[PDB]
Design an enzyme around this catalytic site. Structure first.
Site, PDB file in Angstrom:
ATOM      1  N   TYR A  22       0.868  -1.167   0.000  1.00 45.64           N
ATOM      2  CA  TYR A  22       0.000   0.000   0.000  1.00 45.64           C
ATOM      3  C   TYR A  22       0.908   1.220   0.000  1.00 45.64           C
ATOM      4  CZ  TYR A  22      -3.853  -2.896   1.985  1.00 45.64           C
ATOM      5  OH  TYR A  22      -4.833  -3.826   2.215  1.00 45.64           O
ATOM      6  N   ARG A  58      -2.975 -12.733   3.635  1.00 43.19           N
ATOM      7  CA  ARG A  58      -4.319 -12.204   3.476  1.00 43.19           C
ATOM      8  C   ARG A  58      -4.697 -12.319   2.003  1.00 43.19           C
ATOM      9  NH1 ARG A  58      -6.659  -7.249   6.281  1.00 43.19           N
ATOM     10  NH2 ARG A  58      -8.250  -8.909   6.254  1.00 43.19           N
ATOM     11  N   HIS A 117      -7.897  -8.014  -1.333  1.00 46.13           N
ATOM     12  CA  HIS A 117      -9.092  -7.330  -0.847  1.00 46.13           C
ATOM     13  C   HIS A 117      -9.009  -5.819  -1.015  1.00 46.13           C
ATOM     14  CE1 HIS A 117      -6.127  -7.260   2.313  1.00 46.13           C
ATOM     15  NE2 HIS A 117      -6.705  -6.151   2.740  1.00 46.13           N
ATOM     16  N   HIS A 134     -10.372  -2.219   0.868  1.00 43.45           N
ATOM     17  CA  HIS A 134     -10.900  -1.604   2.074  1.00 43.45           C
ATOM     18  C   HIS A 134     -11.887  -0.482   1.794  1.00 43.45           C
ATOM     19  CE1 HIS A 134      -7.998  -3.636   4.740  1.00 43.45           C
ATOM     20  NE2 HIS A 134      -7.136  -3.483   3.751  1.00 43.45           N
ATOM     21  N   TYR A 165      -1.436 -10.142   0.417  1.00 44.29           N
ATOM     22  CA  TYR A 165      -0.109  -9.870   0.963  1.00 44.29           C
ATOM     23  C   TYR A 165       0.059 -10.576   2.288  1.00 44.29           C
ATOM     24  CZ  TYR A 165      -2.875  -6.516   3.640  1.00 44.29           C
ATOM     25  OH  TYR A 165      -3.863  -5.942   4.422  1.00 44.29           O
TER      26      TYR A 165
HETATM   27 FE   LIG Z   1      -5.506  -4.562   3.656  1.00 45.17          FE
END
Ligand SMILES: [Fe+3]
Ligand SMILES: CCCCCCCCCCCCCCC(=O)OC[C@H](COP(=O)(O)OCC[N+](C)(C)C)OC(=O)CCCCCCCCC
Ligand SMILES: CCCCCCCCCCCCCCC(=O)OC[C@H](COP(=O)(O)OCC[N+](C)(C)C)OC(=O)CCCCCCCCC
Ligand SMILES: [Fe+3]
Lengths: 309, 309
Positions: free
Chosen positions: B162, B219, B222, B224, B198
C-alpha cells in the site's frame, strides 16, 4: 452482551492459537491459547471498548520502540514475582539462601574488564564522584572463604546513568562495570564512587503508564552483583545504600532485608592513607554466601537477552 | 510452586496496580490490576520459567521496534473479536446490518484526495497492474440511493504493498487511496488495478510468532472501505476478490459472507470502448447499505491512531 463463553468464540480461540494446527511449537500454542483466552475475557468483563483497546495497542508499539519492555517489566512487579517463585522453589528443595537474591534489572552488560582481588571501576570522569571502597568476602556453601570466585559489579554514576545506557554518551565502555576474581582469601575489593539513584526516562512509555497508576518510577541508589563459582549456583543480587529516600519505596520492588548496607564515612587521615585514597571516602562492606548446585545443576540461572560488548 | 493465592502476592498485585495510590486514572488501574492478576496466575498455572518469560519480554520490544503491534493484533483475532462484539450489540438492538462490517486493518491513511462520483485511484506505476473498474451504489437505511455519501477506498498493488507502507519505498502519495462522494444517485465509480493479497513481513515478529503457531501470515486480495453519511453510522468493511486461495483462510479472519465479490473479465472491444479503457479489464460491482444512528449517535465508530498525511 456477552459472547466470550459461546461456542463460536471458544472455537475461534483454538483456531487463532494454532491448536488444531499440525506444525508449530505446542508450548507456545499452550501459552498463547491461555493468554488470549484471558485477554478476550478481560475485554468482555471490564467492557473494554475498541477505543481503549487500540490505545493499548499503540502503547505496546511505543513501549517496544523505546526498548522499554525490560524496564516496565520490573515496574509491574514481574521481576520480583519471579524471584518470589524461585525462593518458594528453593524453599521446597530445602535450600537456605544465605544471601538473598533480588532482581538483575535490564542494565547488565557482558564483557567487562577482569582482574584479580582488586579493581578500580570508575575512570574519574565524574566530578561529583565521592570515592567508595566496596569490599567483602565470598563464602562457599560451607561458609569457608572462596578463592577464584567471579564477582561482577555494575552501577550508575552520580547522575544515575549506567555506561552503555548513558544518554549523554559521556561514559567510556564498561565504566563502573568490572569482574573481580576473589583472591587467595576469597576477597574482592574495589574502588569506585557512590552511585546515585535514578528513575525511568520521564518522557518514556514506562514512566507514563506509571503516572496513570499514580506511581513514581525511581530506584534508590544501589549496586548490582553477579557472583559465580565452580560447584555453585550463580547468585544475582544487589545492595541498597542505606539512608536513601527510596530504599523501601523502589518502583522495581527489589529491596530486601539483608541487602541494605551502610556507607561508612572516613575523614581520618589515618584511614585515608591505609586505603590509598586522596581524601575523605565512604566505605561499604558486603560478604556474600553461595549455594551449591543441585545435583550438578544450577536450577535457577536465567538465560535472558543481555547486551554484550 | 503455588503462591499466587497467598496474601503476599494478592496485596503485591494491588500495590503494583496503584490501587492504593491516590493519584492516577482509576480506569487504567482497574484494567492493569486485572491483566497483571491473570498473567501472574497464568505464569503459575503454566509454570512459565524465567527463561520463557524473558523471551516474551524480548519479543515485545521486538514487536514495538518493528511497529507491528497493529499487525499481530488482527493475527491473534482481536480485531475480529471486537467486530463480533459489535455485531452482538447491534443484534441485541434490532439493527440488521445489510452490509456486514469487518476489520479496518492497520493501513488506513487520512488525507486522500476526494472527488465526486468518479476517480482513477492508481498512478499506473505498477508494471503488472491489471485495470479494474469498481463501482456500486450506496443505499440509506431505507434502501434508497444515497447521494453525497463519502466512500473511502484503499488497497494494495500487485506486489501487495500500500502507498505509505511500501518497504521498497516506491509510491506516489495516496496512490490507490481515494475518497469519493456519491453522485446524484448514490453511485461511486473508480478506475484502479486489481490488488494482490499480501503477507506479514517474513522476517518480522508477527510472522515469527505465527510460525510458532503453525500458521501463515497471508491475506487474500481485498479492498478496504469506509463509508460515512449524515444520519448514518460509519461503515468499515471490505470486499474479497473471489477465487483468491486465501479467501477463506485469511490470517486476520476478516472474510465474511456477502463480502466476496467476483471480478468480471472483459476482453471484447465493445466493453473496452464503452468504459474508456485501453485494453482488457476486470469489473467489480459492489453496493453498500448503511445503518441509522442509534438515538442520535454512532455507537460503533472507532477512534484509533491512523497515519495522516
Ligand atoms: Fe488490507
Ligand atoms: C497485541 C496484543 C495487544 C494487547 C493489548 C490489549 C490491552 C487491552 C487493554 C487496553 C487498556 C487501555 C485503555 C486505557 C485508556 O482508555 O486510555 C489509556 C491512557 C490514556 O490517557 P487518557 O488520559 O485516558 O487519555 C484520554 C484523554 N482524553 C480524555 C482527553 C481524551 O494511555 C496509556 O498508554 C495506558 C494504556 C497502557 C495499557 C498497557 C497494558 C499492557 C500491560 C503490559
Ligand atoms: C512487561 C510485561 C510483559 C509480560 C509478558 C507476558 C508474556 C509471558 C509469556 C511468554 C512466554 C514465552 C514462551 C515462548 C518460548 O518459550 O519460546 C518462544 C519462541 C522461541 O522458539 P524457540 O525455538 O524455542 O527458540 C529457541 C531455539 N534454540 C533452542 C535453538 C535456541 O520465541 C518467540 O519470540 C515467541 C514468544 C511469544 C510470546 C509473546 C506473547 C505476546 C502476545 C500477546
Ligand atoms: Fe540498577
Amino acid at each position: 452482551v456477552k459472547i466470550f463463553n459461546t461456542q463460536d468464540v471458544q472455537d475461534f480461540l483454538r483456531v487463532a492459537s494454532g491448536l488444531e494446527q499440525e506444525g508449530g511449537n505446542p508450548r507456545v500454542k499452550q501459552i498463547i491459547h491461555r493468554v488470549l483466552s484471558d485477554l478476550y475475557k478481560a475485554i468482555e468483563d471490564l467492557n473494554i471498548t475498541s477505543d481503549e483497546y487500540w490505545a493499548g495497542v499503540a502503547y505496546l508499539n511505543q513501549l517496544g520502540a523505546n526498548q522499554e519492555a525490560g524496564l516496565l517489566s520490573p515496574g509491574l512487579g514481574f521481576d520480583h514475582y519471579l524471584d518470589m517463585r524461585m525462593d518458594a522453589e528453593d524453599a521446597a528443595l530445602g535450600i537456605e539462601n544465605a544471601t538473598p537474591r533480588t532482581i538483575e534489572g535490564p542494565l547488565y552488560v557482558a564483557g567487562a574488564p577482569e582482574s584479580v582481588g582488586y579493581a578500580r571501576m570508575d575512570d574519574g570522569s565524574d566530578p561529583n564522584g565521592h570515592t567508595l571502597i566496596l569490599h567483602g568476602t565470598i563464602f562457599d556453601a560451607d561458609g569457608k572463604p572462596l578463592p577464584n570466585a567471579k564477582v561482577e559489579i555494575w552501577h550508575a554514576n552520580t547522575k544515575g546513568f549506567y555506561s552503555h545506557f548513558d544518554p549523554t554518551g559521556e561514559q567510556q565502555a564498561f565504566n563502573m562495570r568490572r569482574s573481580i576474581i576473589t583472591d587467595e582469601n576469597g576477597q574482592y575489593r574495589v574502588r569506585t564512587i557512590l552511585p546515585a539513584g535514578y528513575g525511568c526516562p520521564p518522557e518514556g512509555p514506562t514512566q507514563q503508564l506509571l503516572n496513570q497508576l499514580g506511581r513514581h518510577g525511581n530506584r534508590p541508589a544501589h549496586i548490582h552483583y553477579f557472583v559465580s563459582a565452580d560447584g555453585h549456583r550463580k547468585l544475582t543480587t544487589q545492595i541498597n545504600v542505606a539512608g536513601d529516600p527510596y530504599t523501601y519505596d523502589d518502583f522495581a520492588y527489589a529491596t530486601r532485608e539483608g541487602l541494605v548496607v551502610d556507607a561508612v564515612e572516613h575523614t581520618d587521615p589515618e584511614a585515608i592513607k591505609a586505603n590509598d585514597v586522596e581524601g575523605p571516602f565512604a566505605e561499604m562492606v558486603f560478604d556474600l554466601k553461595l549455594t551449591r548446585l543441585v545435583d550438578g545443576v544450577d536450577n535457577q540461572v536465567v538465560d535472558r537477552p543481555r547486551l554484550a560488548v
